[PDB]
Write a protein that binds this ligand. Structure first.
Ligand SMILES: OC[C@H]1O[C@H](O[C@H]2[C@H](O)[C@@H](O)[C@@H](O[C@H]3[C@H](O)[C@@H](O)[C@@H](O)O[C@@H]3CO)O[C@@H]2CO)[C@H](O)[C@@H](O)[C@@H]1O
Length: 580
């Protein structure tokens, strides 16, 4: 991370151009450049890059992700004074408190609403149950009733929760991580209703954010479900729209999750004071929030003064009506596992590949499962796993067990005794498990239970994966002269010795080179060595140079692992020439 500037990550559905305008004002006053980026999957990328001390100085996301980041030590504790805190609503600060510490600045409160086309549907439906009949009416007129994003569980949750579904039970000021409400009767009822809509062709399981937005904004469907960030595109489309309370289900309100868009500071940032100045004195002001809100609406902002100014907007009132029928998202680390579990359940049930009951049963199990620490190790290198709670020397009451490619199911280990397991995984004096040289067959789960004389029990739970770095990639079978107007084989990139497979990518003039566009094609193959299990990849690049184009291209190929266990590897560049 570069000292003396600010890099900000925010999702691509938010007002990033407006935020960049706030950054320009900061730059005018301070000379400090503010770069706003909107990477894909930034909420998954952040914990990867920040864990190694890289990433943005500031990350924006709803507050639900932040407990996990904080637990991993990826966030700086913020230091607003009490006078600053008093400028924002107390419930918004609660959303960004983790283990007693403020770990992000709250920006705005979001909830989904029903958005409807007033020219098609003057009185929007009060119930989910009336939507099939409404769709039949509209289909007869060449339209449809409802389209919304069915790929992300955020959008389907309000219906799943209505009749009794919940994420984690809240009681005594705490979430019970084992009391999950994903496969109860209420969740099943809601998801069954959704799936029936799809079975009856009132909705399509493939509908995503872009498809639903396009259909609504072109006047093809009478309703959608979306948040405040979507309003600006509807304004542009000129559709005469209203924003209103979500339909009820079985007579009960839909319960959207309430998200607080929040800004965290990277623990690894050398620019923490600049970040504080930007967030407190530039962004969290009437003029700062206005700039962002004018780009894509924020909802009900956390800053009291500006929230009061905008409160008269009936779309914001509807957002708050819906929010106040729903639940605040927990910020606990287990929220990630909950969302992944429910995403899978909804996709599998909606596609018909699994019953609602079976999909939700699996999701329940996954969401409530004990957390495991992800461990990675390079093939051939040693690995040490701590038995938390064990005394530093014997006697120790502990038990290691594992479930890997070397075992059928669970194997319980014993103290060293000369048996063959001792050369693969053995218990050290301090109770740790030592694997002298990991291999592919060691991937799996490793667990320790340590018991103390006072009755204390401590469990350690590890999910172990391994990797190998291939040799530097090479380009072979390359053609140094290219002919415009016909396909030319630039060469074949080859990488040998990876685990897992990884992928090869081509680049032209220091930018990625995209297949099937502008006369580019790639033929790829993967081979696995029968004994070692390591992978060899090939990627053959064809290009059709355009006549009059740049006759001096520079190509290169790189290998990347799926997860960043190591850096990309690159070939030397090649510089074939286009000759007439
Ligand atoms: O579905 C897989 C997905 O799950 C998790 O994403 C959840 C977000 O963490 C949660 O905030 C919410 O996201 C919505 C934003 O709050 C809202 O501002 C707007 O951007 O729409 C978002 C939904 O698309 O809900 C999602 C679950 O749908 C997890 O964090 C992700 O890594 C994972 O991809």
């Amino acid at each position: 991370i570069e000292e003396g500037k600010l890099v900000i990550w925010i999702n691509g559905d938010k007002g990033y151009n407006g935020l960049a305008e706030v950054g320009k004002k900061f730059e005018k006053d301070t000379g400090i450049k503010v770069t706003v980026e909107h990477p894909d999957k930034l909420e998954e990328k952040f914990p990867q890059v920040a864990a190694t001390g890289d990433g943005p100085d500031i990350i924006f996301w709803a507050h639900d992700r932040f407990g996990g980041y904080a637990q991993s030590g990826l966030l700086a504790e913020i230091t607003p004074d009490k006078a600053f805190q008093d400028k924002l609503y107390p419930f918004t600060w609660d959303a960004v408190r983790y283990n007693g510490k403020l770990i992000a600045y709250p920006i705005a409160v979001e909830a989904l609403s029903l958005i409807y086309n007033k020219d098609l549907l003057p009185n929007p439906p009060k119930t989910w149950e009336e939507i099939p009949a409404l769709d039949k009416e509209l289909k007869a007129k060449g339209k449809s009733a409802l389209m919304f994003n069915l790929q992300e569980p955020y959008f389907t949750w309000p219906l799943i929760a209505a009749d009794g579904g919940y994420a984690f039970k809240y009681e005594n000021g705490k979430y019970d991580i084992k009391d999950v409400g994903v496969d109860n009767a209420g969740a099943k009822a809601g998801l069954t209703f959704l799936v029936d809509l799809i079975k009856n062709k009132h909705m399509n399981a493939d509908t995503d954010y872009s498809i639903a937005e396009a259909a609504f904004n072109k006047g093809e469907t009478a309703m959608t479900i979306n948040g405040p960030w979507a309003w600006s595109n509807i304004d542009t489309s000129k559709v005469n729209y209203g924003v209103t309370v979500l339909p009820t289900f079985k007579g009960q309100p839909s319960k959207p999750f309430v998200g607080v868009l929040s800004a965290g500071i990277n623990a690894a940032s050398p620019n923490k004071e600049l970040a504080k100045e930007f967030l407190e004195n530039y962004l969290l002001t009437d003029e700062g929030l206005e700039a962002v809100n004018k780009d894509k609406p924020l909802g009900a902002v956390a800053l009291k003064s500006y929230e009061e100014e905008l409160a008269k907007d009936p779309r914001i009132a509807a957002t708050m009506e819906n929010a106040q029928k729903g639940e605040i998202m927990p910020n606990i680390p287990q929220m990630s596992a909950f969302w992944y579990a429910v995403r899978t359940a909804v996709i599998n049930a909606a596609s018909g590949r699994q019953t609602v009951d079976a999909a939700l049963a699996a999701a329940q199990t996954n969401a409530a499962a004990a957390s495991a620490q992800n461990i990675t190790a390079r093939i051939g290198e040693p690995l040490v796993l701590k038995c938390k709670g064990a005394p530093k020397k014997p006697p120790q009451r502990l038990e290691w067990k594992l479930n890997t490619g070397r075992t059928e199911a669970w194997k319980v280990l014993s103290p060293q005794g000369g048996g063959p397991w001792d050369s693969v995984a053995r218990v050290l004096p301090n109770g740790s498990l030592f694997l002298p040289a990991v291999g592919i067959q060691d991937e799996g789960i490793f667990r320790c239970q340590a018991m103390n004389r006072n009755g204390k029990e401590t469990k350690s739970n590890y999910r172990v994966r391994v990797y190998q770095i291939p040799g530097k990639p090479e380009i072979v079978d390359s053609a140094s002269e290219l002919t415009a107007g016909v396909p030319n084989k630039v060469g074949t990139c080859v990488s040998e010795g990876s685990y897992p497979a990884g992928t090869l990518s081509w680049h032209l003039d220091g930018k990625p080179l995209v297949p099937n566009e502008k006369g580019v094609s790639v033929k790829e193959q993967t081979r696995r060595h029968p004994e070692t299990g390591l992978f060899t990849l090939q990627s053959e690049l064809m290009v059709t140079p355009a006549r009059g184009g740049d006759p001096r291209p520079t190509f290169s190929c790189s290998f990347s692992p799926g997860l960043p266990r190591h850096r990309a590897l690159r070939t030397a560049p090649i510089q074939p020439r286009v000759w007439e």
